Design a protein around this motif. Structure first.
Motif, PDB file in Angstrom:
ATOM      1  N   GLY A 146       0.782  -1.277   0.000  1.00 57.72           N
ATOM      2  CA  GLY A 146       0.000   0.000   0.000  1.00 57.72           C
ATOM      3  C   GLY A 146       0.793   1.295   0.000  1.00 57.72           C
ATOM      4  O   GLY A 146       0.341   2.283  -0.534  1.00 57.72           O
ATOM      5  N   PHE A 147       2.049   1.269   0.468  1.00 59.34           N
ATOM      6  CA  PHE A 147       2.943   2.398   0.433  1.00 59.34           C
ATOM      7  C   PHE A 147       4.043   2.281  -0.625  1.00 59.34           C
ATOM      8  O   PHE A 147       4.845   3.256  -0.751  1.00 59.34           O
ATOM      9  CB  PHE A 147       3.667   2.567   1.823  1.00 59.34           C
ATOM     10  CG  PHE A 147       2.819   3.216   2.929  1.00 59.34           C
ATOM     11  CD1 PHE A 147       2.333   4.508   2.790  1.00 59.34           C
ATOM     12  CD2 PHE A 147       2.516   2.537   4.066  1.00 59.34           C
ATOM     13  CE1 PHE A 147       1.604   5.130   3.833  1.00 59.34           C
ATOM     14  CE2 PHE A 147       1.788   3.145   5.123  1.00 59.34           C
ATOM     15  CZ  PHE A 147       1.368   4.458   4.995  1.00 59.34           C
ATOM     16  N   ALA A 148       4.113   1.180  -1.427  1.00 56.03           N
ATOM     17  CA  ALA A 148       5.286   0.914  -2.295  1.00 56.03           C
ATOM     18  C   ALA A 148       5.388   1.988  -3.410  1.00 56.03           C
ATOM     19  O   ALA A 148       4.356   2.490  -3.941  1.00 56.03           O
ATOM     20  CB  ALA A 148       5.183  -0.466  -2.944  1.00 56.03           C
ATOM     21  N   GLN A 149       6.622   2.298  -3.811  1.00 59.37           N
ATOM     22  CA  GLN A 149       6.885   3.343  -4.831  1.00 59.37           C
ATOM     23  C   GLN A 149       7.941   2.902  -5.781  1.00 59.37           C
ATOM     24  O   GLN A 149       8.867   2.135  -5.428  1.00 59.37           O
ATOM     25  CB  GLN A 149       7.371   4.639  -4.103  1.00 59.37           C
ATOM     26  CG  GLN A 149       6.416   5.337  -3.182  1.00 59.37           C
ATOM     27  CD  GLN A 149       5.249   5.923  -3.899  1.00 59.37           C
ATOM     28  OE1 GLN A 149       5.394   6.803  -4.724  1.00 59.37           O
ATOM     29  NE2 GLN A 149       4.081   5.472  -3.563  1.00 59.37           N
ATOM     30  N   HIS A 150       7.852   3.370  -7.041  1.00 61.30           N
ATOM     31  CA  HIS A 150       8.995   3.289  -7.970  1.00 61.30           C
ATOM     32  C   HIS A 150      10.109   4.222  -7.511  1.00 61.30           C
ATOM     33  O   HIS A 150       9.859   5.441  -7.390  1.00 61.30           O
ATOM     34  CB  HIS A 150       8.533   3.709  -9.359  1.00 61.30           C
ATOM     35  CG  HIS A 150       7.508   2.800  -9.962  1.00 61.30           C
ATOM     36  ND1 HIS A 150       7.809   1.535 -10.447  1.00 61.30           N
ATOM     37  CD2 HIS A 150       6.161   2.958 -10.120  1.00 61.30           C
ATOM     38  CE1 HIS A 150       6.705   0.974 -10.913  1.00 61.30           C
ATOM     39  NE2 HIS A 150       5.702   1.832 -10.760  1.00 61.30           N
ATOM     40  N   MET A 151      11.314   3.721  -7.208  1.00 67.35           N
ATOM     41  CA  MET A 151      12.400   4.556  -6.688  1.00 67.35           C
ATOM     42  C   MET A 151      13.772   4.027  -7.146  1.00 67.35           C
ATOM     43  O   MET A 151      14.087   2.870  -6.870  1.00 67.35           O
ATOM     44  CB  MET A 151      12.413   4.583  -5.136  1.00 67.35           C
ATOM     45  CG  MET A 151      11.271   5.381  -4.550  1.00 67.35           C
ATOM     46  SD  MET A 151      11.272   5.395  -2.806  1.00 67.35           S
ATOM     47  CE  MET A 151      12.706   6.328  -2.347  1.00 67.35           C
ATOM     48  N   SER A 152      14.514   4.783  -7.971  1.00 64.49           N
ATOM     49  CA  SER A 152      15.875   4.350  -8.312  1.00 64.49           C
ATOM     50  C   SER A 152      16.790   5.111  -7.329  1.00 64.49           C
ATOM     51  O   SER A 152      16.336   5.978  -6.551  1.00 64.49           O
ATOM     52  CB  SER A 152      16.223   4.760  -9.766  1.00 64.49           C
ATOM     53  OG  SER A 152      16.685   6.144  -9.800  1.00 64.49           O
TER      54      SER A 152
END
Ligand SMILES: COc1cc(Nc2c(C#N)cnc3cc(OCCCN4CCN(C)CC4)c(OC)cc23)c(Cl)cc1Cl
Ligand SMILES: COc1cc(Nc2c(C#N)cnc3cc(OCCCN4CCN(C)CC4)c(OC)cc23)c(Cl)cc1Cl
Length: 261
Positions: A146-152
């Motif tokens: 529910g909190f996950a994000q695309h992040m490099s």
């Protein structure tokens, strides 16, 4: 439209146990949320969660089997995990022996490497979000994206994400953070498995906040006795400054973890 393809059998917590009409041995857990309950933000976040989950398949991540809705509700249809959650597994034993904790951390590391190499951060790692395939000799699986994000490695974020007893201190202290927050949270999980509670467990929220903002280095209790390589890992995950914290690569290669072997 409607919830199609499943027979509900039981309330699990709203969450229902169900089986597929086409294969009655395929058991699922269905999370039901009222659309009334969700912000504009929350609709936008749910859509990013589904897009993240649809693209992935891993032995240590709970699979999204389907996503449905009707007039009033959304339904997340997940792989059923018969062993409950890691929170209960720990609390019913009080503490886990180092040897058990080690097998568990190696499974969790496999899932974190899969997500990291795809530039995905979970951002809410904790024992309540880790589910068990069975009660004995479990396979652990990551739940609740529910909190996950695309992040490099380039990306810097500001909005608070996660759970108070698990959040990396830079989120509160610096009001900016990067993907290395998840290594803090992994440190908290390991500490909780070995000692019984998160390192910042407190009588009040104000007491917890003081601990989050402190500059004092974390002191690992001297009992139970742990191997030097266990302590070394723990101490380097629980570094408050993300720039001094153990790297992703160094975590995956640490001799106590050793994901290649
Ligand atoms: C954390 O986040 C999420 C959690 C869920 N929830 C579950 C998923 C998932 N995923 C999978 N499988 C589940 C299995 C469950 O119970 C198994 C039986 C345990 N025993 C029952 C008998 N007694 C005596 C001992 C304990 C279950 O129970 C509450 C919830 C499940 C969902 Cl659907 C969505 C999100 Cl976001
Ligand atoms: C945003 O992120 C986070 C914020 C927090 N912080 C708090 C949470 C939460 N959550 C909840 N409740 C809190 C209550 C507090 O104070 C209550 C006492 C008020 N005073 C008593 C003395 N009199 C004279 C004046 C009023 C409080 O105070 C500093 C911080 C709280 C945490 Cl702990 C973790 C995370 Cl990740």
């Amino acid at each position: 439209p409607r919830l199609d393809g499943f027979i509900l059998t039981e309330r699990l917590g709203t969450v229902y146990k169900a089986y597929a009409k086409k294969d009655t041995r395929e058991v699922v857990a269905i999370k039901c949320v009222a659309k009334k309950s969700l912000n504009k933000a929350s609709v936008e976040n749910l859509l990013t969660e589904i897009e993240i989950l649809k693209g992935i398949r891993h032995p240590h991540i709970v699979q999204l089997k389907d996503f449905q809705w009707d007039s009033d509700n959304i339904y997340l249809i997940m792989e059923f995990c018969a062993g409950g959650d890691l929170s209960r597994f720990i609390h019913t034993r009080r503490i886990l022996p180092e040897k058990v904790a080690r097998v568990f951390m190696q499974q969790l590391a496999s899932a974190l490497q899969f997500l990291h190499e795809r530039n995905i951060s979970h951002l809410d790692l904790k024992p309540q979000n880790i589910l068990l395939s069975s009660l004995e000799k479990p396979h652990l699986k990551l739940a609740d994206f529910g909190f996950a994000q695309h992040m490099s490695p380039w990306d810097e974020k500001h909005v608070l994400r996660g759970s108070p007893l698990y959040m990396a201190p830079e989120m509160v202290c610096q009001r900016q953070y990067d993907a290395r927050v998840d290594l803090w949270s992994m440190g908290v999980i390991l500490y909780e498995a070995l000692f019984g509670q998160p390192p910042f467990a407190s009588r009040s929220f104000s007491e917890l906040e003081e601990k989050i903002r402190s500059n004092r280095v974390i002191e690992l209790p001297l009992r139970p006795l742990l191997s030097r390589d266990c302590r070394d890992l723990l101490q380097r995950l629980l570094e408050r400054d993300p720039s001094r914290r153990i790297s992703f690569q160094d975590f995956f290669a640490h001799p106590w973890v050793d994901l290649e072997h």
